[PDB]
């Protein structure tokens, strides 16, 4: 039973809690009982939902891609034909989880992926096909798939998950960061070079996923859309940051677009208005 | 008795006095410390060149000229030419350092104006082009001169709009980072003590900036009538608990 | 074989359910957690940090003057500023309090409002910061402002007043979204005496307004925010 407000009466004193100096960079914990006469109230509240494992720990959509089950005879590279699709795993392509994560500089969490696959036949199908998706977790250095059915999909050491379309996949991935936390922000470079990329680092590299329909093909085409949902768990967060105000433009960069809209709402009246 | 305004910081053979200070900020209430054995991964015995590098290095003074937008310095980049600390930064593969950052701006009781002196860990700068354009190495590594935020955009450089903190956030929300104000009414001095803040125990000091120091005028400089419409701002930075590991040849950076 | 019955909601993906799932990486040993300063366990920790309010959002562009509340010399009894206290809207929408408040639907507890005087040290001002609890309008003359919760602020060697907004909502939480039933009331500053400037100094001096949360502050019913948006997925 935490006290929210103490009972305070009239004070006429030299102890003045409500005068301070913001120059010191501190926020004085000034209570309501410091400047008005209060009564005793209780919190009845523990702050469990603003906990960072509750805050970062529900499933956000992080990626939507499409793969096609299709006749592959006479197709050059099979990735432009969407016969398979690889996704470099990041939590910054879709901005709703990105803004929550980038409230912190460093974050460490075990991941928990939920992959939903949904099909559609936009033209001339007699039936909806019972399809199976392979989601192969591809770490950096693994051979990337170049065909939808090459040797890489054997996955003797890569983690794969088979699941039906319409059904969903679910697997947790541990914290796979090389450092003690992921870098949401990286003020630097991979090396001392005049042309190397800024901010794009392997310190938030989480692996990659490769997706294909494992079925061969039917007479009609099937468009399978994959929706990876990420839930962070065992979340640890460091260095709270200023929240994002402007729209993002790219993965891994703090860039904002040119000639953007003002984010502070202009008041209708003057500074005196309500 | 003793004032909270009269402070002395002695580091090495360097001393800073102030008689118009605020209370010094220790970032996240953590004093700089050497790397303990339980956190270390690098197996080299680190060199701790204590009084020769952990000492105050005064940077070039900035003139705050009533239309100034602000100034950003990068650490350890602002101290890459500063004595033995600058040399150990290039001869070693690795290094970790905390900082005492001290910012000076004196004025008369007739002056007004307020500086935001803020320390931002991993201040990843935005490009002025948007999209996926990166900032070149020489622009996030300016050294002693820092980044003048009132200067124009240069191709390959960061965006210099002070309202968006050069990173797409807002200026008012920088106070979540460890900061002080130099309000000329109250203090002429901002003192911020920074620990080593990184996801790694020790890191490359030349390709990575751990923290940035931004000195931002919030309330503009109003000088009294007939006075010089300019105040010098001096930034004095001392490394603290500085380790260096992996000694090799002197690394050549872009300049 | 155990006879089981399958319930409703079987095979559903509730995105907020917190279950155990198989690991794709058995026997993986993650990187040792080193000590990093500034660990956050709870967002109620960091909304007790005061951040600047853009009270002067009277421009057509985001600028530093939006954070600057102007004071003027020869002014008795007038209003310095006024605002409503919808903390997920208005001047508060972009502050750190208001950004984290917009991830939640309900808020309770007391606000912490700071003003920082930034004029010259030989200037003097007395201001009166009024909180009007809801039911009445936004005050119009300083006479109806001081009938509510107010602090008279003499400006001297300490440049910062800290006015709390005490909690007025028997409906135990309010909405973070602007809702008329759960309006928090009005905030206004008035010239108590006036701003007196020293000789050889002219013009305006500025106030800096800060907002934070008291430790009795509550947030619940986590929701998506209206701040960030997206048309297409971002690329590398």
């Amino acid at each position, epitope marked *: 039973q935490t006290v929210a407000s103490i009972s305070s009466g009239p004070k006429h004193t030299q102890k003045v809690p409500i005068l301070t100096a913001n120059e010191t960079g501190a926020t004085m914990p000034v209570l309501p009982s410091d400047s008005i006469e209060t009564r005793t109230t209780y919190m009845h509240f523990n702050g469990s939902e603003t906990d960072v494992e509750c805050f970062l720990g529900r499933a956000a959509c992080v990626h939507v891609t499409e793969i096609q089950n299709k006749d592959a005879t006479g197709i050059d590279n099979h990735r432009e034909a969407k016969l398979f699709n690889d996704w470099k795993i990041n939590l910054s392509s879709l901005v709703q989880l990105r803004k929550k994560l980038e409230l912190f500089t460093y974050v460490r969490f075990d991941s928990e992926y939920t992959i939903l696959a949904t099909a559609s036949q936009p033209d001339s199908a007699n039936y909806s096909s019972n399809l199976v998706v392979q989601a192969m977790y591809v770490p950096p250095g693994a051979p990337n798939p170049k065909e939808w059915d090459d040797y890489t999909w054997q996955s003797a050491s890569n983690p794969s998950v088979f699941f039906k379309v319409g059904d969903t996949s679910r697997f947790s991935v541990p914290y796979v960061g090389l450092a003690s936390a992921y870098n949401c922000f990286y003020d630097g470079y991979s090396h001392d070079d005049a042309e190397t990329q800024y901010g794009i680092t392997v310190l938030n590299h989480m692996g990659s996923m490769a997706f294909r329909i494992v079925n061969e093909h039917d007479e009609h085409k099937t468009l399978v859309k994959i929706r990876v949902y990420h839930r962070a768990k065992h979340v640890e967060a460091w260095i709270p940051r200023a929240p994002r105000a402007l729209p993002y433009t790219s993965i891994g960069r703090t860039n904002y677009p040119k000639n953007t809209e003002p984010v502070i709402k202009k008041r209708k009246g*003057d*500074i*005196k208005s309500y | 008795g003793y004032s909270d305004r009269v402070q002395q910081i002695t580091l090495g053979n360097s001393t800073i006095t102030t008689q118009e200070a605020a209370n010094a900020v220790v970032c996240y209430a953590e004093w700089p410390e050497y790397l303990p054995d339980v956190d270390a991964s690098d197996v080299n015995k680190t060199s701790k060149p204590d009084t020769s590098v952990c000492r105050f290095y005064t940077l070039d003074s900035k003139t705050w000229t*009533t*239309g100034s937008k602000g100034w950003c310095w990068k650490l350890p980049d602002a101290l890459k030419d500063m004595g033995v600390f600058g040399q150990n930064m290039f001869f070693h593969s690795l290094g970790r350092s905390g900082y005492t950052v001290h910012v000076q701006c004196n004025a008369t009781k007739f002056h007004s104006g307020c500086l935001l002196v803020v320390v931002i860990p991993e201040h990843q700068l935005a490009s002025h082009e948007g999209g996926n354009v990166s900032v070149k190495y020489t622009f996030t590594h300016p050294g002693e001169r820092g980044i003048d935020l009132s200067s124009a955009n240069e191709v390959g450089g960061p965006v210099k709009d002070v309202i968006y903190n050069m990173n797409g956030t807002l200026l008012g929300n920088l106070l979540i980072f460890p900061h002080q104000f130099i309000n000329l009414r109250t203090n002429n001095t901002a003192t911020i003590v920074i620990p080593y803040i990184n996801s790694v125990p020790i890191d490359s000091m030349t390709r990575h900036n751990n923290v940035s120091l931004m000195v931002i005028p919030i309330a*503009p400089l*109003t000088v009294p*009538t007939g006075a010089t*419409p300019s105040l010098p701002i001096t930034v004095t930075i001392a490394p603290m608990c500085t380790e260096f590991s992996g000694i090799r040849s002197k690394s050549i950076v872009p300049q | 074989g155990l006879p089981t019955t399958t319930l409703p909601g079987s095979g559903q993906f509730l995105t907020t359910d917190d279950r155990q799932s198989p690991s794709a990486l058995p026997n993986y040993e993650p990187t040792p957690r080193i000590h990093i300063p500034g660990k956050v366990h709870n967002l109620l920790e960091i909304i007790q940090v005061d951040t600047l309010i853009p009270m002067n959002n*009277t*421009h*057509t*562009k985001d600028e530093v*003057n939006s954070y600057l509340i*102007p004071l*003027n*010399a*020869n*002014r*008795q*009894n*007038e*209003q310095v500023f006024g605002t409503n206290l919808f903390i997920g809207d208005g001047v508060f929408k972009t502050t750190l309090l208001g950004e984290i408040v917009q991830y939640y639907t309900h808020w309770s507890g007391s606000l912490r409002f700071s003003l920082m005087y930034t004029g010259p040290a030989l200037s003097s001002a007395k201001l009166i910061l009024a909180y009007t609890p809801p039911g009445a309008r936004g005050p*119009q*003359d300083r006479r109806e402002a001081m009938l509510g919760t107010h602090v008279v602020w003499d400006i001297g060697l300490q440049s910062t007043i800290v006015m709390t907004i005490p909690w007025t909502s028997g409906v135990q939480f309010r909405y973070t979204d602007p809702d008329t039933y759960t309006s928090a009331g009005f905030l206004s500053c008035w*010239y108590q005496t*006036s701003l007196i400037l020293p000789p050889e100094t*002219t*013009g*305006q001096v500025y106030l800096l307004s800060f907002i934070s949360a008291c430790p009795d502050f509550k947030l619940r019913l986590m929701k998506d925010t209206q701040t960030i948006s997206q048309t297409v997925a971002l690329t590398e």
Partner: antibody
Amino acid sequence: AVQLAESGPALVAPSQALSITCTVAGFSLTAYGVAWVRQPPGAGLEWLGAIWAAGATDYNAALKSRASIAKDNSKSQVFLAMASLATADTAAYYCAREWDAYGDYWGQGTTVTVSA
Amino acid sequence: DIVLTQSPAALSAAAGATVAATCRASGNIHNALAWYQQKAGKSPQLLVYAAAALAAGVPSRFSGSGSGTAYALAINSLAADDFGAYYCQHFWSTPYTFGGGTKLEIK
């Protein structure tokens, strides 16, 4: 509808007093101040003075001895009184509601001719 | 006091040109400057407040710029409605003195 309607005698003998009024509609004088600006024909605008939202007044530095601005908050009338007129006071006089302390909502203006 | 020196006295131009009127102040206004449009025999109309921000119902041809003591009012592609006399006024405490005035004429 924020309106500031000037009204004056418009024909004043020199070395006399002005009694130029602005009846205020659309706002209250307790909340917004009123600026006064004249413009002689051919020449440019001259700021005469401002009464602020609670009766504090500021004036043109060359006309502090002549001009005096007062108001009635209940009658919504702001008064401009210029004593000891000269022939260079022939001007169309304007009122303005204050708007971020800037003057706008300028009235139609009444021309005053100071002649004998 | 603060003297506003507005320059030049007159600028004759045709419809569709780029015209900049300039006010130089004796002291720093800190962007507390207003630009006014006055047509022939009409009340002054506020175009730009805070030296850069367009007022209510002002077309986007007008653009205020400048800071400190120097301030510019630029018009892109003059229309026929944009002719008349233009005035600065600063608002830095008091007195709120005007500039001299720029009259826009037709070639």
